[PDB]
Amino acid sequence: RFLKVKNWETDVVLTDTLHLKSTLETGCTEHICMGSIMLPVRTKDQLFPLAKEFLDQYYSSIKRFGSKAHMDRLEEVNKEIESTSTYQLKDTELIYGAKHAWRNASRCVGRIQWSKLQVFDARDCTTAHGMFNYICNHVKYATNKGNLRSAITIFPQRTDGKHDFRVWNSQLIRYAGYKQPDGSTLGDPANVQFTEICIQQGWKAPRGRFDVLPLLLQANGNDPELFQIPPELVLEVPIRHPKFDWFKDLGLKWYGLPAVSNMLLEIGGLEFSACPFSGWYMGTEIGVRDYCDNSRYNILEEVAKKMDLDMRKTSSLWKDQALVEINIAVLYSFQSDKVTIVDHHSATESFIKHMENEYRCRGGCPADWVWIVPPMSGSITPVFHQEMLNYRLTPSFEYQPDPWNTHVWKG
Ligand X SMILES: C[C@H](O)[C@H](O)[C@H]1CNc2nc(N)[nH]c(=O)c2N1
- 51's CB contacts (< 8 A; 6+ apart) are 74, 77, 78, 81, 87, 268, 269
371 counts as binding ligand X under rule CB under 6 A: yes
User: Among this protein's residues, is 103 annotated catalytic?
Assistant: no
Nearest to 259 by CA among 394, 409, 134, 76: 134
Which listed range, 170-178, 214-222, 322-330, 385-393, lies at the site for ligand X (CB under 6 A)? 385-393
Catalytic: which of 225, 271, 285, 358?
285
Is 370 known to sit in a ligand binding site?
Answer: yes
C-alpha torsion sign, points 257, 263, 264, 267: negative
The option from ligand X, ligand HEM, Zn ion, none interacting with 41 (CB < 5 to 8 A, set by class) reads none
HSE, CB side, 13 Å, CA atoms: give it for residue 9. Answer: 11
Residues in the chain after which the backbone breaks (C–N beyond 2.5 Å): 40
CA dist 383 and 375 (Å) reads 12
CA dist 63 and 77 (Å) reads 20
* DSSP strand pairing (151-154 vs 118-121): parallel
The site map against a second copy for 261-300 (x = CB under 8 A) is ----------------------x----xx--xxxx----x
CA dist 179 and 186 (Å) reads 6
For the CB of residue 67, give the shortest distance to ligand HEM in the complex, in Å.
Answer: 29
The site map against ligand X for 22-61 (x = CB under 6 A) is --------------x-x-----------------------
For the CB of residue 94, give the shortest distance to a second copy in the complex, in Å.
Answer: 27
State the Cα torsion 225-230-235-236 to the nearest 10°.
80
Q: In the set 156, 258, 287, 366, which binds ligand S85 (CB under 6 A)? A: 258
Chain positions 346 to 375 lying near ligand HEM, rule: CB under 6 A, are: 347, 371
Catalytic: which of 73, 103, 111, 158?
111
Catalytic: which of 102, 203, 280, 318?
280
Is 102 known to sit in a ligand binding site?
Answer: no
Longest dimension (CA), the chain: 74
DSSP letters spanning 169-220? SSBSS-B-EEE-TTS-EEE-GGGHHHHHHHHHTT------TTPBPPEEEE-T
278 counts as binding ligand S85 under rule CB under 6 A: yes
Is 33 known to sit in a ligand binding site?
Answer: no
User: Among this protein's residues, is 108 annotated catalytic?
Assistant: yes
Q: Which residues are catalytic?
A: 108, 111, 280, 285
Return residues touching ligand X (CB under 6 A): 8, 36, 38, 370-371, 384-387
Return residues touching a second copy (CB under 8 A): 3, 5-6, 8-10, 19, 22, 25-38, 283, 288-289, 292-295, 300, 314-317, 319-321, 323-324, 327-328, 331, 335, 343, 345-346, 368-370, 373-380, 384-391
Q: Which residues are annotated as a binding site?
A: 36, 108, 171, 280-281, 285, 370-371, 384, 399
